Structure formats: structure tokens, C-alpha cells
Design an enzyme around this catalytic site. Structure first.
Site, PDB file in Angstrom:
ATOM      1  N   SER A   1      13.361  21.415 -10.030  1.00  0.00           N
ATOM      2  CA  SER A   1      12.280  22.072 -10.774  1.00  0.00           C
ATOM      3  C   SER A   1      12.140  23.513 -10.246  1.00  0.00           C
ATOM      4  O   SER A   1      13.132  24.252 -10.273  1.00  0.00           O
ATOM      5  CB  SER A   1      10.974  21.245 -10.715  1.00  0.00           C
TER       6      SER A   1
ATOM      7  N   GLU B   1      11.446  15.027 -19.474  1.00  0.00           N
ATOM      8  CA  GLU B   1      10.911  16.094 -18.613  1.00  0.00           C
ATOM      9  C   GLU B   1       9.468  16.447 -18.938  1.00  0.00           C
ATOM     10  O   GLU B   1       8.715  16.864 -18.054  1.00  0.00           O
ATOM     11  CB  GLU B   1      11.751  17.365 -18.708  1.00  0.00           C
TER      12      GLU B   1
ATOM     13  N   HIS C   1      10.124  13.661 -15.173  1.00  0.00           N
ATOM     14  CA  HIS C   1      10.378  14.819 -14.316  1.00  0.00           C
ATOM     15  C   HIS C   1      10.211  14.383 -12.861  1.00  0.00           C
ATOM     16  O   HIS C   1       9.222  13.755 -12.534  1.00  0.00           O
ATOM     17  CB  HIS C   1       9.349  15.868 -14.668  1.00  0.00           C
TER      18      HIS C   1
HETATM   19  C1  LIG Z   1       4.209  16.901  -8.852  1.00  0.00           C
HETATM   20  N1  LIG Z   1       5.612  17.332  -8.580  1.00  0.00           N
HETATM   21  C2  LIG Z   1       5.873  18.334  -7.632  1.00  0.00           C
HETATM   22  C3  LIG Z   1       7.182  18.753  -7.396  1.00  0.00           C
HETATM   23  C4  LIG Z   1       8.240  18.185  -8.110  1.00  0.00           C
HETATM   24  C5  LIG Z   1       8.002  17.184  -9.055  1.00  0.00           C
HETATM   25  C6  LIG Z   1       6.695  16.771  -9.282  1.00  0.00           C
HETATM   26  C7  LIG Z   1       6.487  15.894 -10.128  1.00  0.00           C
HETATM   27  N2  LIG Z   1       6.281  15.055 -10.938  1.00  0.00           N
HETATM   28  O1  LIG Z   1       7.329  14.535 -11.630  1.00  0.00           O
END
Ligand SMILES: CN1C=CC=CC1=CNO
Ligand SMILES: *[C@@H]1O[C@H](CO[C@@H]2O[C@@H](C)[C@@H](O)[C@@H](O)[C@@H]2O)[C@@H](O)[C@H](O)[C@H]1NC(C)=O
Ligand SMILES: *[C@@H]1O[C@H](CO)[C@@H](O)[C@H](O)[C@H]1NC(C)=O
Ligand SMILES: *[C@@H]1O[C@H](CO)[C@@H](O)[C@H](O)[C@H]1NC(C)=O
Ligand SMILES: CN1C=CC=CC1=CNO
Lengths: 532, 532
Positions: free
Chosen positions: A197, A324, A437
Site C-alpha cells: 500500500s 482492494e 486490502h
Molecule cells: C489499516 N491498514 C494499515 C496498513 C496496511 C493495511 C491496512 C489495512 N487494512 O487492510
């Protein structure tokens, strides 16, 4: 002693950690920069002054000051991402997991965490490097970097808060690895940077930035790309948000120097409390303080760099998850809830589209809505919900990444593309959210090998295969074992555009990942928005 | 005598014609207007002055002066549409087929031919009314009307060439039927007007025009709608094309009177020879001299009339064929040929799109291309060819008709929608052309009942069912027999939007005919073109 390492900054003492009925060495919370505190808040980082004596590297460091997600208190789904250590501005540390016995010159992998550039921690359970270090015999580093206004407040022209300082933090840790990893048995000429990400956008940004390129060998980008619409702002927009942050805190706004001085007097939580107020639109998947296209870290627009081949040419491995968008809709869009199926009305659909493409005129909004609506069945709540999920994932992650792979592949030395579409059997998030995601990360770090975590046997096998793809790619620039009997992950090429699914079924090869939708997001919609 | 009829214009003598081992009466070439010749060229028609004695109505009349298709000499596919009688400006006649014995007060059906408003004949083999008159016991009228510059040259403000005179021809024949059909055993209060393509647009135009509404009871529109993009022009565009026609013939252009005088001196073929030169764009499915939105025949824009319910409210039956576009692509678009499969290159596709939507800017062209391209398989010659076929059929026929049915249905008294998708087994046109524009007509007129024409038994059955749908609709406003055991053709309603397929299989009911594509053509693209 195996746990003692003399580096160019001083001696460090690690700790023996158990892992899957064996052990390795961990050196946790090694400083790579001077604490960026006081009059250094917003400043480029400075290298850590060498220390006498022995740095105790037995325990995880502080996490950087950040917004903390309290949307579901007690819920592990969201809390597993929150800082699990005390927050401090004194947060510029890295962590190293070293096989035992200490290797001589082995492949290094450096993890850069995501979190929208407004959050993230190197110390999360899900980022524990021991399984990968142990299983694949790599030296695993996780770095940290300043997030939020602390990392990315941008007043271009000022040298006290120029922007991009969080990226420079990342660069300083890469420099430290370059300089010192040899003493831990790492080969500094075979460093792979990898991240998810905002961490994947980060990886791509170091590929692009002239001042970062020489510090690593190759790169993996998970669900993130440097050209993502949320990952950078113009110098004018960064300035506007810094002034607006000052406005929220009753700062003197007469000069950069007056503004910066005021922002420096505030407690960290005071900045965090108003951080979300500076966004220009009602939006989801937009974060306040992000990298700035400054003419320095990025010498020109990202697009002109991609077009001209102005970037590091090496091998890359990258891809995306199937769903995602679901995480961001849950948090912002009307009609979405954690404990319902979140069937979405036509009205909530319309509202979702506007939140998802905040920069669009009405024609633009109509174009998106038409592209993602089944007009034979426009009131189907599941279809509208899944449609929004695709809108958000395609716009923000998948199609920018596809634009990046296509541009990169014309000058680079080898591309491997994946599409991760296995939903973990033990996910505590609702089923409507699909393959969420961030939920490939646990597979990359080998958590399914830990029996108490309750994954299936098939999920342990998928994790092992993913870890071995990543590490083999890191070692050789190719995720495939030479002269092996398993199915081959083919090269992504300009002509054939091949990728593989990553899941528990036998590997399937596909072509032109989401091309219909990505032509819309990458070619048609921008042309529509420019003309109107 | 059965073959002698005294009408208000004088006595007419018909002829006994054989039909399917029986006989009926035919009264062919009955005049309904004064010959529109000489100083009357371009003028509104005048009623035919009554005659003494007996009009010989034993033979088909002259056809109106028109462009003759010579693209495939000797080929019946195209030649079956060409005039089969001598052409003359003296062409304002109608034909009546009367059951034998003469009925007392039976359902009347009046056919209005298509041909793009630039051509067409009442006398075609495929328009022979005897099968329908005989089989369904209706009185079948086919009228004629002026086409090309003769029918539609429009110099608004002038009374010598005001435009729409071909529509007024149609109206005069409807007036004559109103006034006189009772003497042939027709019920003047149960007249259905029906027509294909330009004849279907015509039917819809009489539904709209205040001066036509009272002259018929109900209406059938085949592959044509009054709002079609090719079926009318503005008063300014009509004027421009009339001046441009004059320019092609070296006319004095100083005044309408000078222009009209010059155009009146020319032989008919001189106008026809340059008729195609006046179109504003390189285009397919656009014709030079068409109805004009004049403030008289049409009191306001077609769209505002449709929106406000400013039209005759009655029952309508209408629909389209599966492959409306193929005929026009064959004649104009690059890459299309009669004797090949016409697989279309990406280049020819791009060129096809521009010909098909001549009024579009580049963004508009991109929008169409994206909507109709499979981006996983963009070089598939079959897909590109079929895609163009859909573009042309959707833009020009299907989506305008769908817009019309939806608008009409909110104020009307009953709508029945069909989708004709049976390709005749004896078609001499290539297979790539599919179920071609115009090839439902032969089924409506019952040609498959003629064994020497070599249709299948299943095609005779389809023809019988279609004829009986049309005639029952004409009689009662409902194509279904009351208290019958066959499958019911359901009403098209605003909410459920039902239609049926017409083919040799058991009737299937569907909903929302080509709605995805028609939302694009009817809602999105116009909004795109207006904003850019
Ligand atoms: C809340 N969060 C923080 C960093 C990377 C992913 C993430 C995700 N939720 O999927
Ligand atoms: C190294 O540190 C180990 C763990 O220490 C604890 O946490 C740190 C952050 C300090 O607050 C410390 O006081 C805590 O005990 C110790 O077990 C160990 O004694 C240390 N090793 C040394 C000093 O050689
Ligand atoms: C990568 O670079 C090497 C050495 O220059 C070259 O031989 C090879 O073909 C390249 N591979 C790809 C996939 O571009
Ligand atoms: C048509 O009109 C009649 C009489 O006014 C009415 O009773 C009937 O419901 C109408 N039918 C439809 C389908 O609108
Ligand atoms: C050439 N032509 C003239 C009038 C109506 C239809 C037609 C058709 N080809 O399908």
C-alpha cells in the site's frame, strides 16, 4: 558472540528468538537517525551520531506519532494495524532478523510498512520477520519513517519543512543497510525493498528518485504504486494543507517561519486531532500529508519520469488483491457497516461514487456510474455494493498499478505480476469485504505456518509458496527455481501481459489484468476530465 | 360488379388477382393528389380533382423519382428494393387489396414504405398486399409519397418549397382513405398505419403531428422511430442543404425564388445526380432531404412533444431487427464487402466509428469505441465487425426506438414491443450481415406462404403468426386473440418493460431491450457531447 555486531555506528546487542521449534537472532530498535524532535520536527533527518558502548537491541522500538483507529474498539481486525508500542516522535529505528548461524553474505529484504502515509508501525505482529528470515534464510530488515504532518507537511521553498521527509527517513535507513548490513551477514549488493500500500508506493518512489536508486538492487510492490491518486500531491496543494493545518490550530499565518514555529510548539496529538480537517474534498481513500512532487526528490512529474524511462531499471515483482476497495468503503461510505451484508441502495451507490472520485465533475461521475452499473438489474444491493468495491479498488490501487507495470516494463529488466485472491479462512472481517486490502501480507510473512493461528494446511502451503517466490525473486530476480518441476510464473511482457493468480488452487496464468476497467481509469476518464 | 367502386373522387375499376389458390380484388394506382409536376415541384400536394368516367385501376402506378441502387447489378438482394416501374414525378397513387367477397366494414391497414426518405416504392414484390388482405381479411392499402429533394427540399419561410411535402403526401392519402375506404368495405374508424424504417419514422411523425392524428386509429412502427438521428433536420440545416443543392447545379442563389425557379427547371435526374453531395459530414446512415422541424407539421422539437405528451394517444406495436446496422456498413464503411466475411481491422473499426457518429468530437468517438471494444481481444476481426454492426443499429434504430417507446408509454393506451431475430433461410446476402434491416417485412406481408419462394415450413408458420399479430392488433389494439391457448405477447409497461423475440422458436419474453447500450446512446453520450 552471535548476538553481538560491531557496525560503523557502534556495537549492537541482539536477542535470540524462538521460531517454529528453532531459533534465530533479532536486533530490534537499532537507531538510524537522530531523533527528529523539537526544532527538528518537519526537518530532513540527520544520520545517527555513532555511540560508545553497546546498544541494547533486544526490544521493539517506539512507533511514530499517528492517528489511531478507534472505529471498532476491541476488534482485532482493525486493532492489529494500530501501534502496539508507545508512540513517540523519537521513532527512527530499524529491526533485523538474522538466520542462525549468522550467514556470511546472504540476500537481504527490507520491509517498508503502509498505512496511507498517515500511520503504520514496523512492530506489528503481522510484520514479524522471523518466519521469513528463518524459512528462506534471508536477512530481514523492517525500517520505520515519519508519518502524518510529521513526515509529510510540505511548505515548498522552506528548508525547515520541505516535504517528503518521511521518504528521506526511509532513504536513510536504506543507506544504513547499504553501509552496515554486511556485519549482520547480509549482502548489501542484493537488497530487495518491499512494501504494501503506502509502502508499495514508497518502493516505487525510490525506484523513481535519483537519490535512492543506488541503495537497493530490486523491488516488490504489494497493492501500491508511486502514481496512485492518493500517494502524492502538488507543491501548491501541500502548501494549502499545511496552511489549513495552521488555521485549525490558531497559528500565525503571516510566514512559513511563523507557521512552522507555531506547528513546532504543538504537542503531537494536537496535530493529529485536526489532521483530517485539511482534505480539500469529502472523500474516501485520500490522506492529508503525503509525498510532494517537489522537483528534488522527484525531479519532474511522475508521468513524465515513467514515459522517459527516468527511473531505476531492474527487476520488479508486484500485484494486487481481489477486493482492494472494501476496507475504505466500510470506513467512509454511506450504507456500509461491519456487521451487516451492506447491500447498497441506488442512492448510496451514487453517493459512494462521489466519495470515490472526489475530483470528478458530474459528467465524470456519470461516466463511472455507467461503467459500473448493470442496467438490467440496477437495484441489486449486492451488485451495487460489489460495484463500489471495484470502483474504489480499480481507481485507487489496481489501475494505477497496471499503468505503472505497463510503463515500467518498457525499460525494466523483468516484471512479475500477481493477483492475490485467496480469502483467509480465519478472517474476522465480514464476508462482503472479500479478499481485503492488506490480507496478503500475513501470507508473505508466513503467519500461516504458526499452528496456533488456526489457518488451514492449504493456507500454510500457499504461504510457503509465496515466501519462496518473494525470497527467490529477491535472490535472483526471478521468483522461479531454476530447473524446478512446479508451474512457472511467467514474465510479464509488453506484448502478452501475463500474470498469475495467487491462491490455494493450481496456478493459473491470465493476461491483461482488469484491462477493460483500467482503459477506462487510465485512458478515457482522464481525457474526459481534461476536456470538460 | 365487385370490381367497380364509386368513390367521392369518381368510379374506379379494379382487377381480380389470384392469391394462394383463391382470389381477391385489387385496385391499383388510384390517384389521391394532383400530379406534383412543373411549377408544383416542391409544393404541398393538392387533392386530386374528381374525374368523370371510370378510372382503370388494374395496373401498378409509376414510382416517384429517386436514386437507384446500382452497387450490385443483377443482384436480387439490392435490386428487390429498386423501383420496378417507370419513375415519374407523376407518382401520387395508392393501391388497395380487398377481400372477396367485398367486406362491409372491416379493419384497414395502410402501409407506408421506407427507403431513407430518398427512395422507396409502393409496388415492390415484398409489399404485395394480397397475402395479408386475403389471409387476415383486412383491406390493405399502400400509399406513396415524394422522396428526395422532390419530397423534402426545405426552404423555411418560402411557400413554394416549405419542406415536409412528402409527409403531407402521406397525409393526403390518409385523408383519402378516411373519406373513401368505406366504399371498398373498409371501416374508416379502424385504420392502422404501419411502415418500416423511414416508413416507421413516418408513422411516428403522424402520431406527433396535430394535423395527422385524427386520420387513423392506431399504429405499427418497424425498425424506425420519429426521433431517429437520420429522420429530421433543423430548418437551418434543411436550408443549407437546399442552397448547396443549388450550388451543385450552378443555380442563381440570390433568393429562395431564384433558387426554387432554377431547381424547378432541372430534369429530375439532374437533382438526383448531385443529391448526395449536400451532406454536411462523411457519414453512413444519413440522407440528404428529410423531414424538417418546421413549427408547423411539428409544432415544437420532437423531444419536447414526447416529454409533454403532445401526440396522439392510442395503442402502438413496434420493434426492431437484431442486425440493423449491417446493410449500411456494407455500403459505406471501409473493410466491408458483400463476398467476404468482412473481418474488420482496428483501423477500419476506428474509421467505422467516425462514419457512424458523424456529429461527435474526439472524446465522443473515444466514448463509443470504449463502450463497444472488448479490450481482452481488441484485434478480433469478427468482434470488431459485429461491434460496428451494433454501433450502427443501436445509434440509428434501436436506441431511438427505445427512447420513443419509453416516452410514448407514459401517455399512450397500450404498447407491444418485439425483437425480430430470425434470419430467412433463403437470404442471398452474406451471413455476416445476420438478421438484416428490412428482412422482417417479407414475413409481415406473408411471402413465406408462397411455396415457390422456397422458405421453410417453420418460416411459413412464423409469417402466419406475425400477420395474425399485426392484423389482430389492427382490429382490436391487442395482438393477442382473446381467450386463446397460445403464449401471450405481454404489454410493454414503464415499470416492467417487457418484449418478445419474434423467431421460429417458442416465444420468449424478455425485459429492458438493449438497455445498457441505450443508456449510453440516450443519456450519457448526448450529455457528453453537450458538455464538450
Ligand atoms: C489499516 N491498514 C494499515 C496498513 C496496511 C493495511 C491496512 C489495512 N487494512 O487492510
Ligand atoms: C536489554 O534490555 C532487556 C529488556 O529490557 C527492558 O526494556 C527496555 C526498553 C528497558 O526499559 C529496560 O529497563 C527493560 O528491562 C533487559 O532484559 C536486559 O537487561 C538489557 N541488557 C543489558 C542492559 O545488557
Ligand atoms: C536483463 O538484462 C540482461 C543483461 O543486460 C539481459 O541479457 C536480459 O535479456 C534482460 N532481461 C530482461 C527480461 O529484460
Ligand atoms: C386504455 O384506455 C381505456 C379507456 O380509457 C382504459 O380503460 C384502459 O385501462 C387503457 N389501457 C391501457 C393499457 O392504458
Ligand atoms: C434498401 N431498403 C429500402 C427500404 C427499406 C429497407 C431496405 C433495405 N435493406 O434492408
Amino acid at each position: 558472540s552471535e548476538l553481538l555486531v560491531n557496525t560503523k555506528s557502534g556495537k549492537v546487542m541482539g536477542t535470540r528468538v524462538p521460531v517454529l521449534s528453532s531459533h534465530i537472532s533479532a536486533f530490534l530498535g537499532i537507531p538510524f537517525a537522530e531523533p527528529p524532535v523539537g526544532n527538528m520536527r518537519f526537518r530532513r533527518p540527520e544520520p545517527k551520531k555513532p555511540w560508545s558502548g553497546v546498544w541494547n537491541a533486544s526490544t521493539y522500538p517506539n512507533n511514530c506519532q499517528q492517528y489511531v483507529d478507534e472505529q471498532f474498539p476491541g476488534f482485532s481486525g482493525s486493532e492489529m494495524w494500530n501501534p502496539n508500542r508507545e508512540m513517540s516522535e523519537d521513532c527512527l529505528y530499524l529491526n533485523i532478523w538474522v538466520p542462525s548461524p549468522r550467514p556470511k553474505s546472504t540476500t537481504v529484504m527490507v520491509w517498508i510498512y503502509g498505512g496511507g502515509f498517515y500511520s503504520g508501525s514496523s512492530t506489528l505482529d503481522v510484520y514479524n520477520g522471523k518466519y521469513l528470515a528463518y524459512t528462506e534464510e534471508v536477512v530481514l530488515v523492517s525500517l520505520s519513517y515519519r508519518v502524518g504532518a510529521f513526515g509529510f507537511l510540505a511548505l515548498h521553498g522552506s528548508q525547515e519543512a520541505p516535504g517528503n521527509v518521511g521518504l528521506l527517513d526511509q532513504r536513510m535507513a536504506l543507506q544504513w543497510v547499504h553501509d552496515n548490513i554486511q556485519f549482520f551477514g547480509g549482502d548489501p549488493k542484493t537488497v530487495t525493498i518491499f512494501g504494501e500500500s503506502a509502502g508499495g508506493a514508497s518502493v516505487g518512489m525510490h525506484i523513481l528518485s535519483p537519490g535512492s536508486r543506488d541503495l537497493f538492487r530490486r523491488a516488490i510492490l504489494q497493492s501500491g504504486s508511486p502514481n496512485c491518486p492518493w500517494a502524492s500531491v502538488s507543491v501548491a496543494e501541500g502548501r494549502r494543507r499545511a496552511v489549513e493545518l495552521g488555521r485549525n490550530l490558531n497559528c500565525n499565518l503571516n510566514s512559513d517561519e511563523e507557521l512552522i514555529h507555531c506547528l513546532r510548539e504543538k504537542k503531537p496529538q494536537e496535530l493529529i486531532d485536526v489532521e483530517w480537517n485539511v482534505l480539500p474534498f469529502d472523500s474516501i481513500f485520500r490522506f492529508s500529508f503525503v509525498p510532494v512532487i517537489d522537483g528534488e526528490f522527484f525531479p519532474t512529474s511522475l508521468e513524465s519520469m515513467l514515459n522517459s524511462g527516468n527511473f531505476k531499471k531492474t527487476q520488479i515483482l508486484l500485484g494486487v488483491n481481489k477486493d482492494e476497495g472494501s476496507f475504505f468503503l466500510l470506513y467512509g461510505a454511506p450504507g456500509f457497516s461491519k456487521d451487516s451484508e451492506s447491500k447498497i441502495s441506488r442512492e448510496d451507490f451514487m453517493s459512494g461514487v462521489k466519495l470515490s472520485v472526489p475530483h470528478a465533475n458530474d459528467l465524470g461521475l456519470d461516466a463511472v456510474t455507467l461503467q459500473y452499473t448493470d442496467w438490467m438489474d440496477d437495484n441489486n444491493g449486492i451488485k451495487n455494493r460489489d460495484g463500489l468495491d471495484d470502483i474504489v479498488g480499480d481507481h485507487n490501487v489496481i489501475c494505477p498499478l497496471m499503468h505503472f507495470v505497463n510503463k515500467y516494463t518498457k525499460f525494466g529488466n523483468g516484471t512479475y505480476l500477481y493477483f492475490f485472491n485467496h480469502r483467509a479462512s480465519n478472517l474476522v472481517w465480514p464476508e462482503w469485504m472479500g479478499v481485503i486490502h492488506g490480507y496478503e501480507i500475513e501470507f508473505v510473512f508466513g503467519l500461516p505456518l504458526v499452528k496456533e493461528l488456526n489457518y488451514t494446511a492449504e493456507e500454510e502451503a500457499l504461504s510457503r509458496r509465496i515466501m519462496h517466490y518473494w525470497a527467490t525473486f529477491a535472490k535472483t530476480g526471478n521468483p522461479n527455481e531454476p530447473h524446478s518441476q512446479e508451474s512457472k510464473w511467467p514474465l510479464f511482457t509488453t506484448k502478452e501481459q501475463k500474470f498469475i493468480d495467487l491462491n490455494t488452487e493450481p496456478m493459473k496464468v491470465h493476461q491483461r489484468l482488469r484491462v477493460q476497467m483500467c482503459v477506462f481509469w487510465n485512458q478515457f476518464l482522464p481525457k474526459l476530465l481534461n476536456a470538460t
